[PDB]
Design a binder for this molecule. Structure first.
Ligand code: A1IWX
Ligand code: ZN
Length: 257
């Protein structure tokens, strides 16, 4: 099955998922001198005060922090979006070394990691229906650079020992995702895809300009996770990122001058 190795990594995915070579694939390079300020973009609304986290799961690719999405409790609205998008999960992509790990790049710069807060359009009723629509998902992407610790990340770091291997989960209640955001909500936006199989072209991407800082100790703990199951040979969960895909007939819009 698919992964990030030499034998099952991003250059192989097109054989099982031919949309890998499609017209609106993600991630992409954000060329800051080509992206155009769009004064018609509305302010982004991130409403996470009633977020109900549930669980954290090692899925063999990354780890997901899952939320209750049965009501409008943590939602993303405004910006380029029409309607209301419910938070279902967040996860990260990261590298083996601090000079790689992000999926999006900025003027070809790679960040140490990238956080994806995944939301689905409530007009489609559930997540499985939303991924079949061109406007089904909105993913908020936040870059991570290594520097000072991110206090709001530490509860995540401290449970990773308990979900080391594929298929392990742990209770993860009362986690506040607001602690993962930078100060500014300035962003770039473009139409794209899931960055993993099944690579469906269902995402409005919203990528924040301001990175968050995390500590060397925090990212080191990400890199101690395993892709393998318990009782299988250890393979460190590192370099779980897809590289930049062709932009094709797409415009990246900036929310800021
Ligand atoms: C609250 O209820 C839940 C929350 C999550 C789940 N899911 C899980 O896999 C369990 Cl963690 C999945 C899930 O989160 N799949 C992710 C597919 C995806 C790939 C890539 C990207 S990227 N890199 O941002 O482009 C985003 C999204 C699913 C959601 C619905 C059915 S299966 C399940 C429940 Cl019912
Ligand atoms: Zn992702």
């Amino acid at each position: 099955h698919w992964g990030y190795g030499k034998h099952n990594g991003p250059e192989h995915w097109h054989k099982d998922f031919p949309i890998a070579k499609g017209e609106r694939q993600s991630p992409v390079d954000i060329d800051t001198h080509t992206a155009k300020y769009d004064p018609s973009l509305k302010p982004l609304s991130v409403s996470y005060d009633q977020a109900t986290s549930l669980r954290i799961l090692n899925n063999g690719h990354a780890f997901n922090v899952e939320f209750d999405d049965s009501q409008d409790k943590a939602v993303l609205k405004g910006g380029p979006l029409d309607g209301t998008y419910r938070l279902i999960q967040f996860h990260f992509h990261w590298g083996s070394l601090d000079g790689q790990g992000s999926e999006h790049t900025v003027d070809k710069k790679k960040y140490a990691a990238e956080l994806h807060l995944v939301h689905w359009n409530t007009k489609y009723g559930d997540f499985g229906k939303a991924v079949q629509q061109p406007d089904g998902l909105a993913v908020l992407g936040i870059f991570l650079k290594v520097g000072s610790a991110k206090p709001g990340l530490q509860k995540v770091v401290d449970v990773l020992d308990s979900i080391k291997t594929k298929g392990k989960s742990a209770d993860f209640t009362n986690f506040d995702p607001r602690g993962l955001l930078p100060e500014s909500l300035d962003y770039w936006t473009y139409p794209g895809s899931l960055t993993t199989p099944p690579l469906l072209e269902c995402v409005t991407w919203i990528v924040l300009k301001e990175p968050i800082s995390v500590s060397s100790e925090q990212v080191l703990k990400f890199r101690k996770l395993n892709f393998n199951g318990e009782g299988e040979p250890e393979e460190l969960m590192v370099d779980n990122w897809r590289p930049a895909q062709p932009l094709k007939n797409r415009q990246i819009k900036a929310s800021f001058k």
